[PDB]
Amino acid sequence: KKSIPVRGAAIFNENLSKILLVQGTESDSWSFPRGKISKDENDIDCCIREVKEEIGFDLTDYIDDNQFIERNIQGKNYKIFLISGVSEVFNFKPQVRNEIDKIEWFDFKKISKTMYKSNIKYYLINSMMRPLSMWLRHQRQIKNED
Secondary structure, three states, rough: OOOOOOEEEEEEEEOOOOOEEOOOOOOOOOOOOEEEOOOOHHHHHHHHHHHHHHOOOOOOOOOOOOEEEEEHHHHHHHEEEOOOOOOOOOOOOOOOOOOOOOEEEHHHHHHHHHOOOOOOOOOOHHHHHHHHHHHHHHHHHOOOOO
């Protein structure tokens, strides 16, 4: 069933109140970057290499140790490692094959209203909204002083 493994990276604003989407090779599309990951490598270490190479920035102490989510959409395997704690002082830009490079910061509010779709929307995150939200909700709790 699973012959080709795929993994993506989901980054949230410093206030963990908004989602950062990017434009891929597709035209009117909006989602996190993904692709094949190296085998025989620690999922975490693999993240840094795919994160620092894709986003351009590396997360040393701003990356979760054992926090990730799994979800299969349309029979397609889609894995995403939760990584929050980044700052807004640094600018993150996409760095992939020569094509289109555009950044768009969409508020989770809009994503939560995906139902309000009228034309073309990214249902990809809609399916992962459950885990993404629930899990991300946990990180917000720790934000507390205790």
